């Protein structure tokens, strides 16, 4: 091995994965499905 110098790199996208999950968890505080709100209000009234 004049090959001893060959190396594979590693990846770290954990911050990104975590951030997607955090956005998902809390999405209902800022985005409302108009159709679903309309149907809920129709039921309540």
């Amino acid at each position: 091995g004049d090959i001893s110098g060959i190396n594979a790199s590693v990846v770290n996208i954990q911050k990104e994965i975590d951030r997607l999950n955090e956005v998902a968890k809390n999405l209902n505080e800022s985005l409302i499905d108009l159709q679903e709100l309309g149907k809920y209000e129709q039921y309540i009234k």
Partner: protein, 36 residues
């Protein structure tokens, strides 16, 4: 709810890719070590 699901599906897929990419980096690094 559709966007929520798309985000966690995406994140799950990205996590599986990260893990396999890194496991295969390990395999290649181990192979190089063993041969040299």
């Amino acid at each position: 709810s559709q966007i929520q699901e798309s985000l966690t599906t995406t994140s799950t897929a990205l996590g599986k890719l990260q893990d396999v990419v890194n496991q295969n980096a390990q395999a290649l690094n181990t192979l190089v070590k063993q041969l040299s």
